[PDB]
Amino acid sequence: GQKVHPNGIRLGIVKEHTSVWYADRKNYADYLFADLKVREYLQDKLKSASVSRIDIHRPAQTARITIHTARPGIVIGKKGEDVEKLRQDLTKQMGVPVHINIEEIRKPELDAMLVAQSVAQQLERRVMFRRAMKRAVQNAMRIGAKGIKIQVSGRLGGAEIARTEWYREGRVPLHTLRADIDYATYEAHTTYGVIGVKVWIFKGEVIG
Amino acid sequence: PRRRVAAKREVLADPKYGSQILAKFMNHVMESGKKAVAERIVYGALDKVKERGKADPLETFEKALDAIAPLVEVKSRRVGGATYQVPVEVRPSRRNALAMRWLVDFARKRGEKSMALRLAGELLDAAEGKGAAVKKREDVHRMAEANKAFSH
Amino acid sequence: PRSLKKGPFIDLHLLKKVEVAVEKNDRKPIKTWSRRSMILPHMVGLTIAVHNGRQHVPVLVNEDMVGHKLGEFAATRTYRGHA
Amino acid sequence: AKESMKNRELKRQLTVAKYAKKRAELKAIIANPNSSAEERWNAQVALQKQPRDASASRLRNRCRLTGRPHGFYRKFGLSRNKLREAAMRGDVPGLVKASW
Amino acid sequence: QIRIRLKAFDHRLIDQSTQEIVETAKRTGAQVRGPIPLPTRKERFTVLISPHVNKDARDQYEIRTHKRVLDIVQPTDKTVDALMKLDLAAGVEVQISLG
Amino acid sequence: TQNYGTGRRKTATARVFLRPGTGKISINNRGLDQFFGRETARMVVRQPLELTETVEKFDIFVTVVGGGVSGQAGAIRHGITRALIEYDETLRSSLRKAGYVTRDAREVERKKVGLRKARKRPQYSKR
RNA sequence: ACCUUACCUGGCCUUGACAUGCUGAGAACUUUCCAGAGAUGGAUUGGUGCCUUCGGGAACUCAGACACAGGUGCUGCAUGGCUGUCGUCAGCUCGUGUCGUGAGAUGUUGGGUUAAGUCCCGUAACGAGCGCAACCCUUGUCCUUAGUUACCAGCACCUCGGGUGGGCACUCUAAGGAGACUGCCGGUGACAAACCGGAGGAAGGUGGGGAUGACGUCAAGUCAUCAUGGCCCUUACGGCCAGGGCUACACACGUGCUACAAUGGUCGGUACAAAGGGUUGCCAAGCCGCGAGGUGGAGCUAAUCCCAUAAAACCGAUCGUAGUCCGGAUCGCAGUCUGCAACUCGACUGCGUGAAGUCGGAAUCGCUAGUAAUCGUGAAUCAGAAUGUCACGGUGAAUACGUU
Ligand SMILES: [Mg+2]
Ligand SMILES: [Mg+2]
Ligand SMILES: [Mg+2]
Ligand SMILES: [Mg+2]
Ligand SMILES: [Mg+2]
Ligand SMILES: [Mg+2]
Ligand SMILES: [Mg+2]
Ligand SMILES: [Mg+2]
Ligand SMILES: [Mg+2]
Ligand SMILES: [Mg+2]
Ligand SMILES: [Mg+2]
Ligand SMILES: [Mg+2]
Ligand SMILES: [Mg+2]
Ligand SMILES: [Mg+2]
Ligand SMILES: [Mg+2]
Ligand SMILES: [Mg+2]
Ligand SMILES: [Mg+2]
């Protein structure tokens, strides 16, 4: 059958919301619209950079954005001629002033979004999918990662019939609420259609 | 049920008379959760019984149920090609349930002004046995001798 | 129906095309599309061609249709019969 | 959810919002008991002057990302099948799955 | 005699904010009663999950709103008027009344 | 002096105060029968009091919130039981045998998706 | 109802309602008029703008030109994502070892036991993973902190309204904890797993309900929410506007509401809920209407004001089983309200008319305890429109010997 989204079911329990603020009956819809627009725009623009988590906070009539990226050099170039243009543009979109903090993340191969994006862009370049799956799983398991599963669905190769493959290693218990299962999905556009990539990563148990 | 772990709840909430069968008859006559309606209807019926009947109405009640309870009951079992019936002794607990259900369902079918005096009428009729509930009881009883052949 | 706070309701260009019309007697049907408009006793005898969906059906107004709207005298669904 | 249709409902939004005052004044004068039949009738004429594409009844609210005419939740601004997608990612603040 | 009303979505932030403001007020020389909790508003939504016809397949979501009340007896130091940026940080709304 | 008890049953909450007296019985400053109109509620309230032959030994002042008449009657019974045991702490075994101190945990079951009632379902034609 | 809208009739446009790239003219705005069902076309006082390398430039409106833009057009049997179903059933697999020429098999069979591939014991198998269980939410007991707008045990005042002063007793509200673990006793049991009892305890045997849906199956559903490989039209399968239809009607089927009455229908006063929504909003008091409503403007960003009077239930009076003091369909006349507009085609109100229906064939359905049955209340969508969906409480049963 179908499986509930592992991030959503764990909201509040072990995961955290990506937009933390408060609003009322009037400004709530506007704030959600601004958040969705800013997130899609930021992802589309800094596609080249490996951006994973866009955290939004809203103090009184202000806004703060923090970016989790594996490559901070591109955004922080020669002492700040990039993030400032971004601040100005976001203030053009967001009526309130903005605030940017580029957060660098270590171990990119332990982040589900980055692994999914790398696998998808590899499949876009006509690379065999099994090799990509094996390389991603091995890279993840060299460090930590008490379990990882990768699934790819579509017209693999160029066959005119779709199928699903997946490779797992370690343990990935999706029915345990303590476990913080990082999860990601992405789409790779090829000449023969769309290929869907899903990544589950198991870090460990949260006790007490 | 295959498991047979389903225990039974015990109900005993007689308001003034402090009896047992009375409350179960209350539940039998209660419809759609109208417990107070059942209270007043059955108590008016019992008042009519008490004014008509010289003695107390509870022993008249139990005597009436004594003449409606079927001793044996017939139950169809298919031998695998023919539709038979088999007479069996009724479970001792089941006798009171059949008595109450039959008496209520027969008091329901009189057609006079209300069912309080209907219940009184069949309570006095069943007190010796000139009613219709006793008619059905004796019919079901005689079906057993009509089918005594199988029995085992 | 429409509350007594508002007596009539007529398309304004229809009102101008009827009020100007009465300067001379009934000589030509007036083409109308707004089925919603009320009709008073002041266009009695005039023939109005009301739009029906594919044609303008002409109807001659009399004094005995003051309380009925323009569309009631024009049928939009045919139903010639099952057989 | 054709983009022309989104454009022609957004333009309806502007047309409704851009008057925003003549409707109120005219209808208040009409609903005022003591204003004389002349100010009833001229107000009716005035209401019938302006284009029909000005009322709030003509305005059908739509999803701000897809414009799906059905399945709307006005507490948010999203449709039926984007609210869930955004919620499972945690974008909507203070939204979880309920059991009680 | 001022009163402070706190709105939040999750109790984790509101409890921390109430503890911080109570400790600051008691440390600065004010007199403070006991933090009063109000009934939490629960907004219920039920939404179809299938993109096409499956009426019995629902998803139920809930929004919780937590309300807290505090009072200041003997207002002697308005230091809390220099600490809004710290008292409220990300998702707690603070109202002050009867200044 | 006096003693106190609280009885909860079927979303009905009742507070009972027990003092010396003979059993005047006040329901929100109202007569007992003026409150319980033609029902066994009076008898079910008097059950635990009369089980210990102390109907005339005490006076009772109670208040009730929430629920229906049967729920409030059960709440009164439970509350006066908890108040009485606070006075004569040797009859706990008797009430345990009578099963009066034990609260009724039954509560209305919520409605679920795809069902009319909490457990009723549509007819399901198979063709 | 218009819109929604994707269909029909008719009218009206061609780089276009929308994006980028070239050229020219200039502000948007406000222009209070005319023709036109309307898109549209023609007058229309007013201002010539912002910043200036003072040269110029950004934005906005219109005209032309191509590359284009556009499609709810087809293919779910080319796809992603999402969903149903077997089924919340207890199963589905892998590494190493061993057996067989091999497909394969053992593990995972067997004796018990459990809701469970749960557990114990044996045992060429030894271990592991996804499932089961547990961690999450809620409900039932108690404790700590908390006392306004919530509460009122004591004290006093009281105009007898926690109304007032006042208190931190209580209920309650919401955070953190304790508690239930076959824990103790008896018997059975291969002196194992476990079962059957007992005490205590608010709760006893996963306490009650929820969320949680393994490997896969049905080329299952969706190209019309979205995205996307192909194919297709470009004066049209692309756009705009008026009306009409989706609410049609010799019939058939599914899911519902109301009844066929006396455990009822009317009349009078009468007691007790939970949950929730409200500053483009709720809309009180008063006054005028039999009536749906209208004026009015209070209080409220709300445990503070409003929606808002629960109903079935209980007491007294009447009807007397009659197609009726049942039942309300249908219809005639006159009205209220939102809406530009209630004919097609809205919801309610007043008077009058008053049908079928006497408990329903073959056949067929739901339900095991706050369950069925029955009674009312609220929210979403929404200007208006619920017998539908989701949600909350009141009263409250019968039955289960048994597995052919
Ligand atoms: Mg599109
Ligand atoms: Mg609308
Ligand atoms: Mg509940
Ligand atoms: Mg119910
Ligand atoms: Mg059927
Ligand atoms: Mg398919
Ligand atoms: Mg598919
Ligand atoms: Mg071999
Ligand atoms: Mg095998
Ligand atoms: Mg097997
Ligand atoms: Mg297992
Ligand atoms: Mg589980
Ligand atoms: Mg026991
Ligand atoms: Mg198919
Ligand atoms: Mg149209
Ligand atoms: Mg239709
Ligand atoms: Mg009648």
UniProtKB/Swiss-Prot annotation, chain A:
Binds the lower part of the 30S subunit head. Binds mRNA in the 70S ribosome, positioning it for translation. PANTHER family: 30S/40S RIBOSOMAL PROTEIN S3, SMALL RIBOSOMAL SUBUNIT PROTEIN US3C. It holds the Pfam family KH_2. Residues 38-106 form the KH type-2 domain. One of its GO terms (biological process) is translation. The lineage of its organism: Bacteria, Pseudomonadati, Pseudomonadota, Gammaproteobacteria, Pseudomonadales. CDD domains: KH-II_30S_S3. GO terms for cellular component: cytosolic small ribosomal subunit. Belongs to the universal ribosomal protein uS3 family. InterPro entries: KH_dom (IPR004087), KH_dom-like_a/b (IPR015946), KH_dom_type_2 (IPR004044), KH_sf_prok-type (IPR009019), Ribosomal_S3_C_sf (IPR036419), Ribosomal_uS3_bac-typ (IPR005704), Ribosomal_uS3_C (IPR001351), Ribosomal_uS3_CS (IPR018280). Keywords: Ribonucleoprotein, Ribosomal protein, RNA-binding, rRNA-binding. Part of the 30S ribosomal subunit. Forms a tight complex with proteins S10 and S14. This is Small ribosomal subunit protein uS3. GO terms for molecular function: mRNA binding; rRNA binding; structural constituent of ribosome.
Swiss-Prot record, chain B:
Pfam families: Ribosomal_S7. The keyword rRNA-binding applies. PROSITE patterns: RIBOSOMAL_S7. Keywords: Ribonucleoprotein, Ribosomal protein, RNA-binding, rRNA-binding, tRNA-binding. One of its GO terms (molecular function) is structural constituent of ribosome. InterPro entries: Ribosomal_uS7, Ribosomal_uS7_bac/org-type, Ribosomal_uS7_CS, Ribosomal_uS7_dom, Ribosomal_uS7_dom_sf. Gene3D superfamilies: Ribosomal protein S7 domain. Part of the 30S ribosomal subunit. Contacts proteins S9 and S11. HAMAP family: Ribosomal_uS7_B. NCBIfam families: rpsG_bact. One of the primary rRNA binding proteins, it binds directly to 16S rRNA where it nucleates assembly of the head domain of the 30S subunit. Is located at the subunit interface close to the decoding center, probably blocks exit of the E-site tRNA. This is Small ribosomal subunit protein uS7. It comes from Pseudomonas aeruginosa (strain ATCC 15692 / DSM 22644 / CIP 104116 / JCM 14847 / LMG 12228 / 1C / PRS 101 / PAO1). The gene is rpsG.
UniProtKB/Swiss-Prot annotation, chain E:
PANTHER family: 30S RIBOSOMAL PROTEIN S10 FAMILY MEMBER (PTHR11700). PROSITE patterns: RIBOSOMAL_S10. The keyword Ribonucleoprotein applies. Signal peptide: none annotated. The lineage of its organism: Bacteria, Pseudomonadati, Pseudomonadota, Gammaproteobacteria, Pseudomonadales. One of its GO terms (molecular function) is structural constituent of ribosome. Gene3D superfamilies: Ribosomal protein S10 domain. Part of the 30S ribosomal subunit. Keywords: Ribonucleoprotein, Ribosomal protein. This is Small ribosomal subunit protein uS10. HAMAP family: Ribosomal_uS10. It comes from Pseudomonas aeruginosa (strain ATCC 15692 / DSM 22644 / CIP 104116 / JCM 14847 / LMG 12228 / 1C / PRS 101 / PAO1). Belongs to the universal ribosomal protein uS10 family. SUPFAM superfamilies: Ribosomal protein S10. The keyword Ribonucleoprotein applies. One of its GO terms (biological process) is translation. Disulfide bonds: none annotated.
UniProtKB/Swiss-Prot annotation, chain F:
The gene is rpsI. One of its GO terms (biological process) is translation. One of its GO terms (molecular function) is structural constituent of ribosome. This is Small ribosomal subunit protein uS9. NCBIfam families: PRK00132.1. Pfam families: Ribosomal_S9 (PF00380). It comes from the Bacteria. The keyword Ribonucleoprotein applies. The keyword Hydrolase does not apply. InterPro entries: Ribosomal_Su5_D2-typ_SF, Ribosomal_uS9, Ribosomal_uS9_bac/plastid, Ribosomal_uS9_CS, Ribsml_uS5_D2-typ_fold_subgr. GO terms for cellular component: cytosolic small ribosomal subunit. Belongs to the universal ribosomal protein uS9 family. HAMAP family: Ribosomal_uS9_B. Keywords: Ribonucleoprotein, Ribosomal protein.
